Amino acid sequence: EAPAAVVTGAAKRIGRAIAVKLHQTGYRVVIHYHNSAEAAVSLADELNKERSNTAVVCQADLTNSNVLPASCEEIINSCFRAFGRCDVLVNNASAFYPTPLVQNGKTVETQVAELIGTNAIAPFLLTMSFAQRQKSNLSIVNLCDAMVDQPCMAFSLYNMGKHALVGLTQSAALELAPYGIRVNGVAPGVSLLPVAMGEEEKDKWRRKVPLGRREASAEQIADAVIFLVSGSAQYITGSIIKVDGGLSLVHA
Amino acid sequence: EAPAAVVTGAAKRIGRAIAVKLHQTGYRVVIHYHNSAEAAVSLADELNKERSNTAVVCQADLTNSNVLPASCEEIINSCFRAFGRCDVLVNNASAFYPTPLVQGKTVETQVAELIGTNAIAPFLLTMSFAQRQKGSSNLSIVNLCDAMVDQPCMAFSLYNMGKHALVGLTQSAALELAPYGIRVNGVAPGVSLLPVAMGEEEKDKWRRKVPLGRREASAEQIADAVIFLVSGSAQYITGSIIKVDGGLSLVHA
Amino acid sequence: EAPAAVVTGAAKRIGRAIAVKLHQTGYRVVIHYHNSAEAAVSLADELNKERSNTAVVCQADLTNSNVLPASCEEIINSCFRAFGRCDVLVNNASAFYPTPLVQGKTVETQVAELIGTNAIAPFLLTMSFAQRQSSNLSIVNLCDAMVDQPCMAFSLYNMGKHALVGLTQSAALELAPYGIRVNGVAPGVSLLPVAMGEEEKDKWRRKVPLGRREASAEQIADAVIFLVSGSAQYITGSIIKVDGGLSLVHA
Amino acid sequence: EAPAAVVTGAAKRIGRAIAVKLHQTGYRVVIHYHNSAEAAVSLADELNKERSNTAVVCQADLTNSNVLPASCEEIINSCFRAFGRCDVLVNNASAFYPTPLVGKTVETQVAELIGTNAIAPFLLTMSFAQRQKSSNLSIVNLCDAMVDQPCMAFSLYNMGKHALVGLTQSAALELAPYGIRVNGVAPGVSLLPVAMGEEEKDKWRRKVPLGRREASAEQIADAVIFLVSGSAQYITGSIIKVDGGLSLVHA
């Protein structure tokens, strides 16, 4: 039977490109989403029209809280309920906004919980449930960030979250290797910029990229995910592949 | 007059060595602690006997919660209320225990303790530190990281994530606070003082792995690096993390 | 027509797997070799049998010397002479032996072999590659996942491989505006040396988290292939470890 | 008796600050130099005037060649011959100039950039260690905070410095059992010459988060002194950046 993947925040942009390419490759997918219900359900309908009963949606807030463990356990469960298995987990869902150390109107506790939750704690709880329920080509891939060591100004909690994700990637690769589960990452630099991003705001970041002076397409990021879930990456674990067009190599 | 430092989890071991060496260099210290009240107060007594009105304690749980911002603000406030200033912050307090992904604390609690103490508390401490400064000294922060974060212990995933996060704060905060004159750096031990309840056989197993001396670092050795980072000899150093590991991270499996 | 690749030290083991997998995907290959002439020609014969006029050999010492630039120029030239083009360069050739700091080769020779093959040849090859330029041009450098946790007494090897990391980054940066991508593949324990004891091979194997076994040469070639493919067209400056978790294990 | 250090390229700028600062802490210094004879001798004079018989000069080209091993052995010998001991070695001498991949020859570009930044440091380390085979022995290597985000067209330089990182780790590992520590100090922008363009110097200074300015040579030397000091007795294989946050700034 066909394998199954969970992709978090999979309704739009890069998560969608991931889920669609996995689907194109023959996976059944669970499309996790948070606020993007229309796009999530429109996407699962598109994929089910191509192959009946191959896409399902699952809503969940991945903000850290007393209930996050249960939410993540449920996301994994949806995959098993629908498809009877879970072969792959893509941690793509991520909050990203500035959190100045020195003075949007959220509280710091809410900043902490949204940035560290989505980027690190949820990934960890998802990995925990993924692993527990494995009772093959099993693997996890985490959406990281090529610029963690040269981070954006005032994005300390985001950056802290992505660095945590790299440590989860290494820690989880180490511990789950004996269960046959590989754990790896893909680290974009500038990929899709918000549709909002005034077309010349984009170019300020686009002009910085040595390979092409353009952002990555979502499909280019997904290509790396697909490679890491594939049988061509069977020996690869604990690895994080940057797909940044050289941007992290560019000095100030 | 004399500058002041906040040292978290300062009641024993490495934190204590840091607070003692900073005191010996002329700092007034706030000795934060969580459960170690008798050691915290015994230490402040010793330092105030050496120089009156130079050491104060501050109890606070740094587990993550909706009140942790408030606790961290208070820690900083206790330094200003005692000493009228806060010149350095050492983020040393840290929970450390295994959190297996698979095969009595709840995971919510495992998360809140390991991520709180190792990362979120340091972030919040740093925010309160920075907000309380003026907008005229050698202001800096030092974070106690971990040399082994890229080759971590088996089943310590939450701890490791906390330390990696600390690394990212170090960088992020160095970048953001450099314009305020506030340097931010790290010291990354390997094996320093060891558990109370591990056998000499297991302590010897870790010791044998250290290329420089086949021995763990003394707490004073770690403190030496902190002192360097706070000193005027490191005034251009920010965003840097100094490993003090006797080569242990260079040893392959 | 078909693209062409240069693969250094391609006569056996990992370089052979790279050149065969490249050939299997439709590339014409230059099989560079140094001492392994019988295996080089035997491989080019096997590939030309499968597809006539698709494999050629090229002998060259990649020890550092004042003629090394010329050797590396010739390697690239062989590719253009045979196939009219050069689309891919795989820097696989490498010397590897201990060079203790507290000690039959002289140190001048240890330096020239370990630094030349693992770093300066690669640099010179990439220069020649670049100067000689629809397409998907890229370079893949064979690095080593253990550079930060190196073997005892292999300082010149390790320096070579760390230098290869730097070329990777520096070349990626500089050649990106010419459309040329530059990336690496960093094995841990892959094929073991035939002169190793089976007992000492097993000791390294038992260290690998993922399978307690060394990588096959094919498994390394897979990652090279990915990097040269159209699926990696935004990837440059990147080095992919293929080590089964070996570098994440503490002492 | 006072300890002795060798500092390479010590006639001017950062090497000079290192030597001066070591001298100020009670070391006898061997001031190595290449072309800067008048500054080397003028410095040794100043230091000897302060404390008689505590500074000596030693000329050597550190470009890679057949004779580099010998030259590096002599540099170490000059310290033993003058002072009867050698306790620290600072590898500061370095060539730095562009080497585009697309008036010197490439063979000479290779020998100067890789020799000064890497191979000489290795050979010095080898001689240092062999001559040893209370006491605080260490080596400190001048690295470069920007090796992972290198300057455009400085391939060979960057390869050199990455190599130096590798030697640092490899030597730390191998020499730790002899009690010899090996560490590095990684500047970002420190002294920029007043001959370099005010616009281009301003671009660089404006990029530094901490102060919008270059490090003084003395600030770099401070980090060297820390690492040689008894306050760094457990530190080995570590490289300390002294870059004012410059390497944390994205493009």
Ligand SMILES: NC(=O)c1ccc[n+]([C@@H]2O[C@H](COP(=O)([O-])OP(=O)(O)OC[C@H]3O[C@@H](n4cnc5c(N)ncnc54)[C@H](OP(=O)(O)O)[C@@H]3O)[C@@H](O)[C@H]2O)c1
């Ligand atoms: N685009 C880039 O240049 C770039 C660069 C570096 C790294 N990355 C990484 O690549 C990934 C994908 O990037 P993207 O730009 O496609 O991401 P994005 O659009 O900003 O976010 C992806 C998804 O995250 C979900 N999300 C946000 N908050 C959530 C919450 N509290 N709970 C559950 N889900 C939540 C959203 O779901 P809903 O809309 O359904 O609410 C969203 O569709 C992320 O991991 C990101 O950090 C991207």
Ligand SMILES: NC(=O)c1ccc[n+]([C@@H]2O[C@H](COP(=O)([O-])OP(=O)(O)OC[C@H]3O[C@@H](n4cnc5c(N)ncnc54)[C@H](OP(=O)(O)O)[C@@H]3O)[C@@H](O)[C@H]2O)c1
């Ligand atoms: N020892 C080592 O080999 C080693 C190795 C690598 C890195 N490090 C790093 O070096 C630092 C110091 O190490 P160490 O061994 O001295 O540390 P430790 O003894 O394990 O912990 C130091 C203190 O942290 C405080 N702490 C724990 N949980 C807390 C909480 N929830 N709220 C507030 N405080 C809490 C405790 O204070 P109370 O006792 O008062 O409760 C404890 O005494 C740590 O940052 C560590 O991660 C140490």
Ligand SMILES: NC(=O)c1ccc[n+]([C@@H]2O[C@H](COP(=O)([O-])OP(=O)(O)OC[C@H]3O[C@@H](n4cnc5c(N)ncnc54)[C@H](OP(=O)(O)O)[C@@H]3O)[C@@H](O)[C@H]2O)c1
């Ligand atoms: N095998 C591993 O576990 C492993 C681990 C980490 C990294 N790697 C890296 O992966 C790549 C291939 O590894 P491998 O194990 O296949 O390597 P290998 O067999 O040791 O080397 C491949 C070829 O290197 C060539 N070579 C050696 N000295 C040369 C010289 N002076 N001039 C020109 N060519 C020379 C040889 O060519 P000839 O026989 O024709 O003379 C040899 O067949 C290398 O870059 C290696 O450093 C391998």
Ligand SMILES: NC(=O)c1ccc[n+]([C@@H]2O[C@H](COP(=O)([O-])OP(=O)(O)OC[C@H]3O[C@@H](n4cnc5c(N)ncnc54)[C@H](OP(=O)(O)O)[C@@H]3O)[C@@H](O)[C@H]2O)c1
């Ligand atoms: N200044 C900076 O912003 C900066 C930034 C990053 C890293 N660094 C690193 O820090 C160190 C000191 O830098 P700096 O700028 O003071 O250095 P520098 O002026 O460029 O060079 C230092 C000395 O190296 C010696 N040297 C050059 N070529 C040589 C050769 N072929 N043989 C022997 N010696 C040779 C020269 O000595 P003679 O004058 O006697 O010929 C020179 O005075 C270097 O390791 C450097 O790469 C500096």
Ligand SMILES: Nc1nc(N)nc(NC2CC2)n1
């Ligand atoms: N790094 C990152 N992380 C998230 N979650 N979202 C985004 N969106 C980018 C601004 C387009 N980027």
Ligand SMILES: Nc1nc(N)nc(NC2CC2)n1
């Ligand atoms: N917080 C922390 N971090 C590490 N690595 N080790 C320790 N060890 C102490 C015995 C508890 N504590």
Ligand SMILES: Nc1nc(N)nc(NC2CC2)n1
């Ligand atoms: N060139 C190279 N590099 C490594 N790491 N390993 C090997 N193994 C070959 C059998 C010696 N070769």
Ligand SMILES: Nc1nc(N)nc(NC2CC2)n1
């Ligand atoms: N990185 C480096 N290395 C050397 N030797 N010299 C320099 N000089 C810079 C122009 C001040 N930079």
